[PDB]
């Protein structure tokens, strides 16, 4: 213990897809990160939202988080919170920052698809290929039951198709239209915006970082091969001990063929840019960003727990 990560305002960790579980259910989402932060003097809360849903909407994750923030403020006696989200959680965070600017002090997005995911476009295109349209109903029924069963609170508010639609490239562009941010650059620019945003009296510190383990190598006959820079070639134990390692290399290959460029298996570099970009050089796949699975990472991957801890100190020195 010490006060290295002792920020003025409480930190709320915001999850992306999968299960309406903040963590727990069958394993914590932010693996070992809450314990580490607490040990260094931080007040941390983990949001428990719908794993499958859109961010906006009456029953979306955005309104669920707003409610949660209010509960935390009432409990801690604090006046604002620092929001840090991974994946879709970064989009849920932007919603609260937009809808309730006076209750937010900073927004940090880790591997967030601000411009959507090319892999999402792929999955939906596949689903839409069924001329009878029956598959979409069955897979939705299957993913929804999964969500409620994996949910810690066994939340019945799941909508697999809404969540899929949300991570889509086209839908993201509409989201950015409805919930603009000074941290965002022009669409199609692959550029970031300003490091802060002042929503009338309230100023927000904006940060982001991406993982770019999946790099495009060569193209031949149309296809482009990719490389997983987070692992030592072939022999890396991560390939054996963490099944998401190879899985994300594969989804990352599909993305490279959809013109995404370097990515983390789900989100590309350009789609993740927001506010003050601390780095896009991390050799991490989408799940390494949150120290998964069970803390397993490739030999070339930076320590995610260390980066997040260092960031809580960054906020502290910034005054939030
Ligand atoms: Ca991993």
């Amino acid at each position: 213990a010490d006060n290295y990560a002792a920020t003025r305002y409480p930190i709320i960790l915001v999850h992306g897809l999968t299960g309406t579980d903040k963590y727990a259910g069958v394993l914590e989402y932010w693996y070992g990160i809450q314990e580490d932060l607490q040990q260094r003097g931080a007040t941390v809360y983990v949001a428990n939202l719908s794993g499958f849903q859109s961010d906006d909407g009456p029953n979306g994750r955005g309104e669920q988080l707003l409610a949660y923030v209010k509960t935390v403020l009432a409990a801690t006696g604090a006046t604002k919170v620092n929001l840090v989200g991974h994946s879709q959680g970064g989009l849920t965070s932007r919603y609260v920052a937009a809808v309730a600017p006076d209750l937010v002090a900073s927004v940090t997005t880790i591997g967030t698809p601000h411009r959507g995911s090319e892999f999402a476009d792929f999955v939906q295109g596949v689903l839409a290929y069924d001329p009878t349209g029956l598959s979409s109903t069955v897979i939705a029924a299957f993913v929804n039951v999964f969500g409620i069963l994996t949910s810690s609170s066994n939340n019945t508010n799941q909508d697999a198709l809404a969540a899929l639609k949300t991570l889509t490239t086209a839908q993201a562009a509409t989201y950015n239209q409805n919930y603009p941010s000074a941290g965002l650059g022009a669409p199609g620019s692959c550029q970031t915006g300003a490091p802060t945003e002042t929503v009338g009296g309230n100023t927000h510190l904006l940060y982001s970082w991406a993982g770019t383990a999946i790099q495009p190598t060569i193209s031949v006959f149309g296809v482009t091969g990719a490389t997983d820079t987070s692992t030592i070639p072939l022999v890396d134990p991560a390939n054996a001990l963490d099944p998401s390692t190879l899985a994300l290399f594969g989804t990352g290959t599909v993305m490279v063929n959809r013109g995404s460029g370097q990515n983390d298996g789900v989100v590309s570099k350009c789609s993740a840019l927001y506010g003050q970009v601390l780095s896009t050089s991390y050799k991490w796949n989408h799940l390494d960003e949150i120290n998964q699975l069970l803390g397993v990472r490739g030999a070339n991957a930076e320590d995610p727990v260390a980066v997040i801890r260092t960031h809580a100190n960054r906020l502290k020195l910034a005054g939030v």
Side-chain angles (χ1 to χ4, degrees), residues 1-19 22 24-25 27-218 222-320:
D2 68 353
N3 64 324
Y4 180 74
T7 47
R8 178 181 180 150
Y9 302 117
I11 291 172
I12 301 193
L13 298 180
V14 188
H15 72 255
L17 295 71
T18 304
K22 76 242 115 299
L27 170 63
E28 67 175 327
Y29 186 95
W30 296 87
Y31 199 70
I33 297 158
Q34 181 176 33
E35 306 180 335
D36 184 79
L37 285 176
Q38 293 190 328
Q39 192 194 359
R40 296 292 224 127
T43 302
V44 186
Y45 288 89
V46 177
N48 183 200
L49 318 165
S50 289
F52 307 97
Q53 255 296 2
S54 55
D55 291 305
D56 57 348
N59 299 112
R61 295 153 41 93
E63 288 298 318
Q64 294 173 27
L65 186 65
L66 218 199
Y68 188 62
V69 167
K70 292 181 176 183
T71 279
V72 169
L73 291 186
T76 54
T79 55
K80 302 181 182 179
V81 300
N82 286 300
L83 295 173
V84 9
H86 168 238
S87 188
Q88 199 192 163
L91 298 175
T92 314
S93 295
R94 272 178 49 201
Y95 183 84
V96 171
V99 152
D102 58 301
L103 311 183
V104 173
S106 72
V107 183
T108 301
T109 65
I110 306 162
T112 293
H114 292 109
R115 314 303 176 153
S117 169
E118 276 100 345
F119 188 68
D121 294 339
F122 167 68
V123 179
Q124 196 169 266
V126 172
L127 258 180
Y129 206 93
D130 183 7
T132 71
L134 293 177
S135 49
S136 63
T137 70
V138 298
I139 63 92
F142 186 81
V143 181
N144 287 348
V145 171
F146 173 79
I148 62 198
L149 287 172
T150 48
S151 177
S152 51
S153 51
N154 298 295
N155 185 2
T156 51
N157 176 32
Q158 313 294 338
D159 193 332
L161 301 179
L164 174 63
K165 189 188 77 281
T166 300
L167 305 162
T168 264
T169 261
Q171 187 56 44
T174 294
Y175 188 73
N176 296 345
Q177 281 312 285
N178 297 350
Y179 304 92
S181 171
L184 292 176
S189 68
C190 184
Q191 189 69 77
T192 192
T196 67
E197 180 170 37
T198 303
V199 192
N202 313 291
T203 294
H204 295 165
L205 301 183
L206 313 178
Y207 302 99
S208 67
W209 63 85
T212 52
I214 315 308
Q215 296 291 151
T217 50
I218 55 180
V223 309
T224 305
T227 184
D228 184 348
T229 65
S230 77
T231 55
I232 57 179
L234 309 179
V235 310
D236 206 302
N239 284 147
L241 298 168
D242 184 0
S244 74
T245 311
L246 283 163
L248 288 171
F249 168 61
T251 63
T253 295
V254 176
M255 279 182 72
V256 162
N257 288 286
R258 289 301 229 67
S260 75
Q262 61 204 111
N263 54 285
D264 69 6
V266 179
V267 183
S268 67
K269 200 201 85 166
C270 300
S271 177
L273 305 177
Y274 173 84
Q276 184 184 328
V277 182
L278 295 170
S279 171
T280 43
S281 298
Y282 294 128
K283 298 184 177 190
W284 298 329
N285 60 43
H286 205 67
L287 289 198
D288 289 333
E289 293 161 6
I290 52 168
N291 198 42
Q292 295 285 18
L293 295 170
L294 302 175
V296 179
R297 328 178 309 261
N300 304 334
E302 294 80 357
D303 184 6
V305 177
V307 172
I308 293 170
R309 182 200 302 132
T310 295
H311 191 238
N313 179 71
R314 178 176 290 103
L315 295 174
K316 178 175 184 62
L317 311 191
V320 297

